[PDB]
Amino acid sequence: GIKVYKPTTNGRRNMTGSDFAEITTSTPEKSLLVSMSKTAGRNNTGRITVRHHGGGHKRKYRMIDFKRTTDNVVAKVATIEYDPNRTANIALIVYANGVKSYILAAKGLEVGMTVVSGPDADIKVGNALPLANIPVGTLIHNIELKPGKGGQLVRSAGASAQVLGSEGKYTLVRLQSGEVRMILSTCRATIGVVGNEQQSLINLGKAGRTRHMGIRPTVRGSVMNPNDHPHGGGEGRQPVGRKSPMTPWGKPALGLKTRNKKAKSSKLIVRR
Amino acid sequence: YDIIRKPIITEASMAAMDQKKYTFEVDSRAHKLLIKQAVEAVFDVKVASVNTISVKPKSKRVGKYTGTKSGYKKAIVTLTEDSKTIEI
Amino acid sequence: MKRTYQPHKKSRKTTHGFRSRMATKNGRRVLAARRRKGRASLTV
RNA sequence: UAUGAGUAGCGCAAGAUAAGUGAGAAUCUUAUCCACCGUAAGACUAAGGUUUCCAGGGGAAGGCUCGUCCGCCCUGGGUUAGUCGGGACCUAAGGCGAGGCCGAAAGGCGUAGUCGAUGGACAACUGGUUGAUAUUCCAGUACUAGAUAUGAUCGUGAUGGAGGGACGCAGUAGGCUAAGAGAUGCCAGUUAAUGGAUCCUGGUCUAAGCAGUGAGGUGUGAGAUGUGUCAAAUGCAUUUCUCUCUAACAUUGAGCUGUGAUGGGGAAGCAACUACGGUUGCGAACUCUCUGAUGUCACACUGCCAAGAAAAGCUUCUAGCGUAAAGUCAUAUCUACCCGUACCGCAAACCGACACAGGUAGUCGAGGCGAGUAGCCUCAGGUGAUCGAGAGAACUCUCGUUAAGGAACUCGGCAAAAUAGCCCCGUAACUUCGGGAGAAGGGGUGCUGGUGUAAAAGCCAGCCGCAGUGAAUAGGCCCAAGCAACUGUUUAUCAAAAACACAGCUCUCUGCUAAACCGCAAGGUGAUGUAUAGGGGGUGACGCCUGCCCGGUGCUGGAAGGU
RNA sequence: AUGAGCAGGGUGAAGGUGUGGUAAGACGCACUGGAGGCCCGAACCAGGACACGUUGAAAAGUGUUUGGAUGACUUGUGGA
C-alpha cells in the first residue's frame, strides 16, 4: 500500500507516498495514558552512550495489551488506529466489564470480531492460545518464554511469525532467516498476522524529514581523525586496507558473530 | 509590645495628616496585621490597614569608607476616620 | 560579538550558592580553604 | 622621568540667533525658527543594572575639550496591592533522595517522597493624583475567599472510582471589533501680500453584573444484564435492545443590545489670584458613512502526516456523615498574609575594561501614496548625541560626472556600470515531463475631459512633455564543460567548497534480561524495541553496470593429526 | 522540556467535486485547493565577495552587495 507524491520540486523528486488509506479516523483515546520519555540515548552517565539519534516529537505512547492474560470475553475491537511508535497498527477493545483494553492490529480484522482466548478459541485470527493448544504449521506471534509475561520476544512489528513444531516442554518455531527457538509449550500466543506489511519500502527525500523521523545523521568513519576512528585519515578519500574496518570502539565488526554461547540459552536453537 | 520604631516626617507626611494617614516605622520581623493591632492597642486609632513597602539599605560612602546605611520598613498607616490623630 | 557572561540571578547562583558549594563534601572543603584564608567574603 | 609630541586622535548625525544665567558661557537655561528619526532614533516590558530617580546645594577629581550643567559630588526625599508577578496550589525537563542497591573510602545509583516555571490552575477596573507612586493613594462600581453574628437539617459526599483539564501543524472562510478615512456636528478664527474664502480639536465610558444573542461544537437519551469500576457506589464505558437521532436537550460562545454609568473626561478659551509663571474654578458637541486586521470566536472548522506534556485546582460517586446547625443559605459587619513594585532597559545605568560604530527578550507600532512592517516626507512622540573655528593645499578614503573608444587592464569585466516595479504579449534547449522560465526578446506606463467604471479595464479625443514604476525602492544576460545532485551543514579569531551530511543503495552483526554501549560493580541506554528493529562498514538520487583472481591476510566454519 | 515568533505577495501540485469522458474506469475542462528542504521578498538568522579600517569604534567590525527566509528555521526560558 504505497502512493506517491507527484514530482513537483527537487527534493520532492521521488517521495514514495504513504497510503495510510486504511486506518480509523483520528484522535486516539485519552485514558491510554503512557508517559513520554526521551533518553536521547544518553544515560545515567549521559555523555552520548548510544549513537546517532533524536528529533521526533512528544510521542504519546499508550498501553497495548502486551500480555492478554484475560479470558473468554466479548473482547470487542472498535477502531484500528495509527501508531507513531511501531510498524504495525493497533486497535481498541472493550470487554464485558466495560474496559478500554487495546491490541496490536493485524492484516484483515474488523471492528466487532471480538476475538479472544480462554484458550477456548479456535484458529481464527486474534486468539491468545498457547502452542500446546495450537496445531502444527501455523502463523502466530506473541510467544514469550516467561508465561504470564507478554511481549519481549518475536511478537514482531514488520511481519508476524510462524511455527514449525513442538515437543514435550517446548515448541519448534522459526522466527525469520532460518531460525528456530523451542519455547515453553504452555506460554501464550496470538494466531494471526502483523498489522502493516509494506512499511519496509518508503523512500523519503529530505534529511530533515528523516530528522522528523528523529535520528541526527550518521558520519562516515573515513575523513575522521586518527584521534577519531581506525579509518586513518590522511591524503584524499584514501582507501582502507587496515584489516576489516570496524567501530570507533575497539572490536572488529564485519564477519565475526559474538554469540555469547555461555548463556541461559543454546538448548533452544536451530543450526544457525 | 510597643515595638513601633518611630514616625517619619516628609512633605508627604502632611498629606498623610490631611488624609488621616501616617508614616510609622517598626522592626523588620513584623506583620501589618500585628503592628495594626499594636497600633490599635497603644494608640486607640481606627486603622483601615497598612501598605506594604520597605526600604533597601543605602550603601553609599559616609566618611573615609563606605557608609552601609540600613533600610527600614516604611509603614503607611492607613486609618479610618472617627479616632484620635496624633500630631507629633 | 557576544561575550561570556550575561547572567541572570539563577545564573549567578545555582553554581555558587552556599548549599551548592556546601553540598558535595568537596566545594565546602575549598570553602574551608576560603575560610582558613578568610578573604573578603565566603560564598561568592 | 623622557622621547615621539604639541603630532595622531578628540570615538559614525547640523543646528541657529536673541535673551537670561553667572565671574566666567558655544557647549547651562528659556524663547523662536531649522533639522533628524519616526516597523523608530517612539511606549512598554523581560533579564539585567542595583538607587543610577527626583529636589536642593556645590564643581576636588569624572565628563575625551570648556562648563554655572550632569548618570559627577554633598544633603534630603522618593517605589504603597485581597485581585498586579511569585510564594502560602500542582507539576514537567531535572535535581536531591530516607528506604534499598552496589562499591578501598569519599562515593555513585535509586523506590517512596521532596522541591524544582518557561507551563496548568484564579477576583478589579475606570477616573483623578505628585518632584516622583499608581490597576497599589483616593471617587465609583465590583467580585473572590473567610470570619463572627443566623430560619439547616440528616448532609457532606475521599488520596479511592470515574470524568475533566489535556495540548501536532498547515490553510481557508466568515463573524465582530480595535484601529483608521470621510463627511454631520461642535468650538475658535474670513486670514491680508495676486486672488478670496474656509480652518483645525471636535469624534466618551471600565470590567464585574443582568438579560440575551455572531454562532459554534456536541450527539442525544431510555431500559435491562452489569461484567466491572482492586471495597462500595446511584458516578463511569460497554453486553442487549425501545428508540430517535427535529436536535429538543445537555455545552460552549466574539461582539452587541440596554443596564452597569448621566462618569467627569473634554478645547477655544473664560474669569479669579499664586509669581500671573502657573494654579484654582467654570465652560462644546460626544453624530453617522466606509475600510476594518494576522486581534476575536478558535486549532471553531477543513485538511495533512513527522500523529502530537503533566499533575492539580473542578465535577460526580459512595466507603464516612453526631448525621446533634459538620453541613447549609438568608442575615449582619469586618478581614484578606509575605516578597517584588522607583528609574533605565535597543541602552550614557545592561553584557562589550570606556558616556564604545557590537550584542540583547518579547508586545504595540500613524497617514499619504504604496501588495507591502520595503521606500519617501511629514503623525503622535522623542532628539540636536558631545571640541571647534578657519581656509579650501597636495595627498588618503567615501560620493558625483565624463568625449571618443571599448576590456584591449589584469592571472582573471575584479569592483563600479546596466538592467529590474507593475501589467500585457511571448518564450528555445533538454527534461527525471514538474520544470526550464521572470528564459530570452517585445510592448505599455503622465495628465485633461468625456464613457465605464464605481464591481471593472478599455475607449475617445485633447493637453503636454527631454524624460511618464519622472525620483526612491526592486534580476545583467546567453552558450558550453567539469565537479557535486539539490535544500542543509562546514573551521566563530582565514579557507563554504568538489568537504561533510543526506534520502538512496550495498554488505555484515543481533532472536532478547538483546547485540552493541556506558559504568568497578550496581544501575541504565539500546527501546515499554522486538530481525521491515537495532548496531557497524562502504557508497551517496535517478539511468546503465559492477568483470576476474581464495595464492597471502583477516573473517567464518570444521575437526584428523602437530603444538 | 516549556514558550515565543517568523510582514506581505505570487506559485500551483496532490486531494476532492461535477459534468462532456467512459459498459466501466482511465480522459476533458472547470471548481475548490494549498503541499511545497516552492519562489520572490520583510523582520530574523547567517557570512559569499568587494572597499574601508586594521597600535583599529572593535580580542574580530563597518559599509555595499549575497543567501535562507515555514524550516534539519531562529531563539527565549530553565536545565543535563
Residue numbers in the entry:
A (entry chain BD): 2 to 273
B (entry chain BW): 4 to 91
C (entry chain B6): 1 to 44
Question: How does the study describe this entry?
Answer:
Ribosomes are responsible for peptide-bond synthesis and are a main target for antibiotics. They translate the genetic information from mRNA into a defined sequence of amino-acid residues, which eventually fold into mature proteins. HPFlong is a dual domain protein that forms a dimer in solution. We report a novel mechanism of ribosome dimerization via a long-HPF-type two-domain protein.
We furthermore obtained a density-map of the L. lactis 70S ribosome as part of the dimeric complex at 5.6 Å resolution, and were able to confidently align two copies of the ribosome to reconstruct the 100S structure thus significantly improving the density at the interface. Using the recently published structure of the 70S ribosome of the Gram-positive bacterium Bacillus subtilis (PDB-code 3J9W21) as a starting model, as well as the highest resolution E. coli 70S structure (PDB-code 4YBB22), we were able to model the structure of the L. lactis 70S ribosome. Along with the rRNA, we successfully assigned most of the ribosomal proteins except uL1, L7/ L12, bL9, uL10, and uL11. Additionally, we assigned protein bS21 in our map, which is absent in the model of B. subtilis ribosome. After localization of all known ribosomal protein subunits, two regions of undescribed density remained, which we assign to HPFlong. One density is located at the interface between the 30 and 50S subunits, and the other at the interface between both 30S subunits. The HPFlong N-terminal domain (residues 1-102), located between the 30 and 50S subunits, is in close proximity to proteins uS7 and uS12 and interacts with the 16S RNA at several locations. The C-terminal domain is located at the center of the 30S–30S interface. The C-terminal domain of HPFlong is thus a dimer stabilized by hydrophobic patches and intermolecular β-sheet formation. From the perspective of one 70S ribosome in the dimer, the main interaction is between its uS2 protein and copy A (randomly assigned) of the HPFlong C-terminal domains; whereas RNA helix 40 and most likely the N terminus of bS18, interact with the copy B. Chain bS18 also interacts with RNA helix 26, which seems to be involved in the dimerization through interactions with helix 26 of the opposing ribosome (at least in L. lactis).
